Amino acid sequence: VFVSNGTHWFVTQRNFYEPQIITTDNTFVSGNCDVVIGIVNNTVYDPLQPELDS
Amino acid sequence: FAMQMAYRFNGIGVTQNVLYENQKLIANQFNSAIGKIQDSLSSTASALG
């Protein structure tokens, strides 16, 4: 599931809390934000992004 | 509750994007289906055999 403390957004397994920074690789794309009731704005991390500067 | 149904779908091998992309329809489907339970139990005499 997704969760936040109130300042940092995270994803965690559903039966023992362990916050992961929300990377692409924790997640999958669908559609657009018009249809999902209660969706939230954020940034999602791309692990390749710094490697493009390297 | 929608976040629960997104697990219920994930448990039958349906990826949960198919839930939220349909939530208002799935609500209407289930509300209507509960509606038929009144009629099924109320109108039929043999229903509790």
Coordinates of N, CA, C and O in Angstrom, one line a residue:
Chain A
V1 N 0.9 -1.2 0.0 CA 0.0 0.0 0.0 C 0.9 1.2 0.0 O 2.0 1.2 0.4
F2 N 0.3 2.4 -0.4 CA 1.0 3.7 -0.2 C 0.6 4.2 1.2 O -0.4 4.0 1.7
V3 N 1.5 5.0 1.8 CA 1.4 5.6 3.1 C 2.2 6.9 3.2 O 3.2 7.0 2.5
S4 N 1.9 7.8 4.1 CA 2.8 8.8 4.5 C 2.7 9.1 6.0 O 1.7 9.0 6.6
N5 N 3.9 9.6 6.6 CA 3.9 10.2 7.9 C 3.2 11.5 8.0 O 2.8 12.0 9.0
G6 N 3.1 12.2 6.8 CA 2.6 13.6 6.6 C 3.5 14.5 5.8 O 3.0 15.5 5.3
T7 N 4.8 14.1 5.6 CA 5.8 14.9 4.9 C 6.5 14.1 3.8 O 6.8 14.7 2.8
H8 N 6.7 12.8 4.0 CA 7.3 11.9 3.1 C 6.3 10.8 2.6 O 5.7 10.2 3.5
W9 N 6.1 10.7 1.3 CA 5.3 9.6 0.8 C 6.1 8.3 0.6 O 7.2 8.4 0.1
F10 N 5.5 7.1 0.9 CA 6.2 5.8 0.9 C 5.2 4.8 0.4 O 4.0 4.9 0.4
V11 N 5.8 3.6 0.1 CA 5.1 2.3 -0.1 C 5.6 1.3 0.8 O 6.8 1.3 1.2
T12 N 4.8 0.4 1.3 CA 5.2 -0.6 2.3 C 4.4 -1.9 2.1 O 3.3 -1.8 1.7
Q13 N 5.0 -3.1 2.4 CA 4.3 -4.3 2.4 C 3.1 -4.2 3.5 O 3.2 -3.4 4.4
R14 N 2.1 -5.0 3.3 CA 0.8 -4.8 3.9 C 0.6 -5.4 5.3 O -0.5 -5.3 5.9
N15 N 1.6 -6.2 5.8 CA 1.5 -6.9 7.1 C 2.7 -6.7 8.0 O 2.8 -7.4 9.0
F16 N 3.6 -5.8 7.7 CA 4.7 -5.3 8.6 C 5.3 -4.1 8.0 O 5.9 -4.1 7.0
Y17 N 5.1 -2.9 8.7 CA 5.5 -1.6 8.1 C 7.0 -1.6 7.8 O 7.9 -1.7 8.7
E18 N 7.4 -1.3 6.5 CA 8.7 -0.9 6.2 C 8.7 0.1 5.0 O 8.3 -0.3 3.9
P19 N 8.9 1.3 5.2 CA 8.8 2.4 4.2 C 9.9 2.2 3.2 O 11.1 2.3 3.5
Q20 N 9.5 2.1 1.9 CA 10.3 2.3 0.7 C 10.0 3.6 0.1 O 8.9 4.0 0.0
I21 N 11.1 4.4 -0.3 CA 11.0 5.5 -1.2 C 10.2 5.0 -2.4 O 10.6 4.0 -2.9
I22 N 9.2 5.7 -2.9 CA 8.4 5.3 -4.0 C 9.2 5.4 -5.3 O 9.3 6.4 -5.9
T23 N 9.9 4.3 -5.7 CA 10.5 4.2 -7.0 C 9.5 3.6 -8.0 O 8.6 2.9 -7.7
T24 N 9.8 3.9 -9.3 CA 9.2 3.2 -10.4 C 9.1 1.7 -10.2 O 8.0 1.1 -10.4
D25 N 10.1 1.1 -9.7 CA 10.2 -0.4 -9.6 C 9.4 -1.0 -8.5 O 9.1 -2.2 -8.6
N26 N 8.9 -0.2 -7.6 CA 7.8 -0.6 -6.6 C 6.4 -0.6 -7.2 O 5.4 -0.9 -6.5
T27 N 6.2 0.0 -8.4 CA 4.9 0.5 -8.9 C 4.6 0.1 -10.4 O 5.5 -0.2 -11.2
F28 N 3.4 0.3 -10.8 CA 3.0 0.2 -12.2 C 2.1 1.3 -12.6 O 1.3 1.9 -11.8
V29 N 2.1 1.7 -13.9 CA 1.4 2.8 -14.5 C 0.0 2.3 -14.8 O -0.2 1.2 -15.3
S30 N -1.0 3.2 -14.7 CA -2.3 3.0 -15.5 C -3.0 4.3 -15.8 O -2.9 5.3 -15.0
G31 N -3.7 4.4 -16.9 CA -4.6 5.5 -17.3 C -4.1 6.9 -17.1 O -2.9 7.2 -17.4
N32 N -4.9 7.8 -16.5 CA -4.5 9.1 -15.9 C -5.3 9.4 -14.7 O -6.3 8.7 -14.3
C33 N -4.9 10.5 -13.9 CA -5.4 10.8 -12.6 C -6.9 11.3 -12.6 O -7.4 11.6 -11.5
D34 N -7.6 11.4 -13.7 CA -9.0 11.8 -13.8 C -10.0 10.8 -13.1 O -11.0 11.2 -12.6
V35 N -9.6 9.5 -13.2 CA -10.6 8.4 -12.9 C -10.5 7.9 -11.5 O -11.5 7.5 -10.9
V36 N -9.3 7.9 -10.9 CA -9.0 7.3 -9.6 C -9.6 8.2 -8.4 O -9.0 9.2 -8.1
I37 N -10.6 7.8 -7.8 CA -11.3 8.5 -6.7 C -10.3 8.6 -5.5 O -9.8 7.6 -5.1
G38 N -9.9 9.8 -5.1 CA -9.0 10.0 -4.0 C -7.5 9.9 -4.3 O -6.7 9.9 -3.3
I39 N -7.1 9.9 -5.5 CA -5.6 9.9 -5.9 C -5.0 11.2 -5.4 O -5.6 12.3 -5.3
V40 N -3.6 11.2 -5.1 CA -2.9 12.4 -4.6 C -1.7 12.7 -5.6 O -1.1 11.9 -6.2
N41 N -1.4 14.0 -5.6 CA -0.2 14.5 -6.3 C 1.1 14.2 -5.5 O 1.1 14.3 -4.3
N42 N 2.2 14.0 -6.2 CA 3.5 13.6 -5.6 C 4.6 13.7 -6.7 O 4.3 13.9 -7.9
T43 N 5.8 13.4 -6.4 CA 6.9 12.9 -7.2 C 7.2 11.4 -7.0 O 7.3 11.0 -5.9
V44 N 7.3 10.6 -8.1 CA 7.8 9.3 -8.0 C 9.3 9.2 -8.5 O 9.6 9.8 -9.5
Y45 N 10.1 8.4 -7.8 CA 11.5 8.4 -8.1 C 11.8 7.4 -9.3 O 11.3 6.3 -9.4
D46 N 12.8 7.8 -10.2 CA 13.3 7.0 -11.2 C 14.8 6.7 -10.9 O 15.7 7.5 -11.0
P47 N 15.1 5.4 -10.5 CA 16.5 5.0 -10.2 C 17.5 5.2 -11.3 O 18.7 5.3 -11.1
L48 N 17.1 5.3 -12.6 CA 18.0 5.6 -13.7 C 18.3 7.1 -13.8 O 19.3 7.4 -14.5
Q49 N 17.6 8.0 -13.2 CA 17.7 9.4 -13.5 C 19.2 9.9 -13.2 O 19.7 10.5 -14.1
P50 N 19.8 9.7 -12.0 CA 21.2 10.1 -11.8 C 22.2 9.4 -12.7 O 23.2 9.9 -13.1
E51 N 21.9 8.1 -13.1 CA 22.8 7.4 -14.0 C 22.9 8.0 -15.4 O 23.9 7.9 -16.1
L52 N 21.8 8.7 -15.8 CA 21.9 9.5 -17.0 C 22.9 10.7 -16.9 O 23.5 11.1 -17.9
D53 N 23.1 11.3 -15.8 CA 24.1 12.3 -15.5 C 25.5 11.7 -15.3 O 26.5 12.3 -15.7
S54 N 25.6 10.5 -14.7 CA 26.9 9.8 -14.6 C 27.6 9.5 -15.9 O 27.2 8.7 -16.7
Chain B
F1 N -12.6 1.5 2.1 CA -13.2 0.3 1.5 C -12.8 0.1 0.0 O -12.5 -1.1 -0.4
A2 N -12.6 1.1 -0.8 CA -12.1 0.9 -2.2 C -10.7 0.4 -2.2 O -10.3 -0.4 -3.0
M3 N -9.9 0.8 -1.2 CA -8.5 0.3 -1.0 C -8.5 -1.1 -0.5 O -7.6 -1.9 -0.9
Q4 N -9.5 -1.6 0.2 CA -9.7 -3.0 0.4 C -10.1 -3.7 -0.8 O -9.5 -4.7 -1.2
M5 N -11.1 -3.3 -1.6 CA -11.4 -4.0 -2.8 C -10.3 -4.1 -3.8 O -10.1 -5.1 -4.5
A6 N -9.4 -3.1 -3.8 CA -8.2 -3.2 -4.6 C -7.3 -4.3 -4.2 O -6.5 -4.8 -5.1
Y7 N -7.3 -4.8 -3.0 CA -6.7 -6.0 -2.6 C -7.5 -7.2 -3.0 O -7.0 -8.1 -3.6
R8 N -8.8 -7.2 -2.8 CA -9.7 -8.3 -3.1 C -9.5 -8.7 -4.6 O -9.4 -9.9 -4.9
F9 N -9.4 -7.8 -5.5 CA -9.1 -8.0 -6.9 C -7.7 -8.6 -7.1 O -7.6 -9.6 -7.8
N10 N -6.7 -8.0 -6.5 CA -5.3 -8.5 -6.5 C -5.3 -9.9 -6.0 O -4.4 -10.7 -6.5
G11 N -6.2 -10.4 -5.2 CA -6.2 -11.8 -4.7 C -6.8 -12.8 -5.7 O -6.6 -14.0 -5.5
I12 N -7.6 -12.3 -6.7 CA -8.1 -13.1 -7.8 C -7.4 -12.9 -9.1 O -7.9 -13.2 -10.2
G13 N -6.1 -12.4 -9.0 CA -5.3 -12.2 -10.2 C -5.8 -11.1 -11.1 O -5.5 -11.2 -12.3
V14 N -6.6 -10.2 -10.6 CA -7.0 -8.9 -11.4 C -6.2 -7.8 -10.8 O -6.2 -7.5 -9.6
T15 N -5.4 -7.1 -11.6 CA -4.6 -6.0 -11.2 C -5.4 -4.8 -10.8 O -6.3 -4.4 -11.5
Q16 N -5.1 -4.2 -9.6 CA -6.1 -3.3 -9.0 C -6.4 -2.0 -9.7 O -7.3 -1.3 -9.4
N17 N -5.6 -1.6 -10.7 CA -6.0 -0.5 -11.6 C -7.3 -0.7 -12.3 O -8.1 0.2 -12.4
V18 N -7.7 -2.0 -12.6 CA -9.0 -2.3 -13.1 C -10.1 -2.0 -12.0 O -11.3 -1.8 -12.5
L19 N -9.9 -1.9 -10.7 CA -10.9 -1.5 -9.8 C -11.1 0.1 -9.8 O -12.2 0.5 -10.1
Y20 N -10.1 0.9 -9.6 CA -10.3 2.3 -9.5 C -10.7 2.9 -10.8 O -11.6 3.8 -10.8
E21 N -10.2 2.4 -11.9 CA -10.7 2.9 -13.3 C -12.2 2.5 -13.5 O -12.7 3.0 -14.5
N22 N -12.8 1.7 -12.7 CA -14.2 1.3 -12.7 C -15.0 1.6 -11.4 O -16.1 1.1 -11.3
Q23 N -14.5 2.3 -10.5 CA -15.1 2.3 -9.1 C -16.5 2.7 -9.1 O -17.3 2.0 -8.5
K24 N -16.9 3.7 -9.8 CA -18.3 4.2 -9.8 C -19.3 3.2 -10.4 O -20.4 3.0 -10.0
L25 N -18.8 2.4 -11.4 CA -19.5 1.3 -12.0 C -19.6 0.1 -11.1 O -20.6 -0.5 -10.9
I26 N -18.5 -0.2 -10.4 CA -18.5 -1.4 -9.5 C -19.4 -1.1 -8.3 O -20.1 -2.0 -7.9
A27 N -19.4 0.1 -7.8 CA -20.4 0.6 -6.8 C -21.8 0.4 -7.3 O -22.6 -0.3 -6.7
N28 N -22.1 0.9 -8.5 CA -23.5 0.7 -9.1 C -23.9 -0.7 -9.3 O -25.0 -1.1 -9.0
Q29 N -23.0 -1.6 -9.8 CA -23.1 -3.0 -10.0 C -23.5 -3.6 -8.6 O -24.5 -4.4 -8.6
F30 N -22.7 -3.4 -7.6 CA -23.0 -4.0 -6.3 C -24.2 -3.5 -5.6 O -25.0 -4.3 -5.1
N31 N -24.4 -2.2 -5.6 CA -25.7 -1.6 -5.1 C -26.9 -2.2 -5.8 O -27.8 -2.7 -5.1
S32 N -26.9 -2.4 -7.1 CA -28.0 -3.0 -7.9 C -28.1 -4.5 -7.5 O -29.2 -5.0 -7.2
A33 N -27.0 -5.2 -7.3 CA -27.0 -6.6 -7.0 C -27.5 -6.8 -5.6 O -28.4 -7.7 -5.4
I34 N -27.2 -6.0 -4.6 CA -27.8 -6.0 -3.3 C -29.3 -5.7 -3.4 O -30.1 -6.4 -2.7
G35 N -29.7 -4.8 -4.3 CA -31.1 -4.6 -4.6 C -31.9 -5.8 -5.0 O -33.0 -6.1 -4.4
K36 N -31.4 -6.7 -5.8 CA -32.0 -7.9 -6.2 C -32.1 -8.9 -5.0 O -33.0 -9.8 -5.1
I37 N -31.3 -8.8 -4.0 CA -31.4 -9.7 -2.8 C -32.7 -9.4 -2.1 O -33.4 -10.4 -1.6
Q38 N -33.1 -8.1 -1.9 CA -34.4 -7.8 -1.3 C -35.5 -8.6 -2.1 O -36.3 -9.3 -1.5
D39 N -35.6 -8.4 -3.4 CA -36.6 -9.0 -4.2 C -36.6 -10.5 -4.2 O -37.6 -11.1 -4.1
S40 N -35.4 -11.1 -4.3 CA -35.2 -12.5 -4.3 C -35.8 -13.1 -3.0 O -36.5 -14.1 -3.0
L41 N -35.5 -12.5 -1.8 CA -35.9 -13.0 -0.5 C -37.4 -12.6 -0.2 O -38.1 -13.4 0.4
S42 N -37.8 -11.4 -0.6 CA -39.1 -10.9 -0.3 C -40.2 -11.4 -1.2 O -41.3 -11.9 -0.7
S43 N -40.0 -11.4 -2.5 CA -41.0 -11.8 -3.5 C -41.2 -13.3 -3.6 O -42.4 -13.8 -3.7
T44 N -40.1 -14.1 -3.7 CA -40.2 -15.6 -3.7 C -40.6 -16.2 -2.4 O -40.0 -15.9 -1.3
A45 N -41.5 -17.2 -2.4 CA -42.0 -17.8 -1.1 C -41.0 -19.0 -0.7 O -40.8 -19.2 0.5
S46 N -40.4 -19.7 -1.6 CA -39.5 -20.9 -1.4 C -38.1 -20.5 -1.1 O -37.2 -21.4 -0.9
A47 N -37.7 -19.2 -1.0 CA -36.3 -18.8 -1.0 C -35.4 -19.4 0.2 O -34.2 -19.6 0.0
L48 N -36.0 -19.6 1.3 CA -35.4 -20.1 2.5 C -35.6 -21.6 2.8 O -35.8 -22.1 3.9
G49 N -35.6 -22.4 1.7 CA -36.0 -23.8 1.7 C -35.3 -24.6 2.9 O -36.0 -25.3 3.6

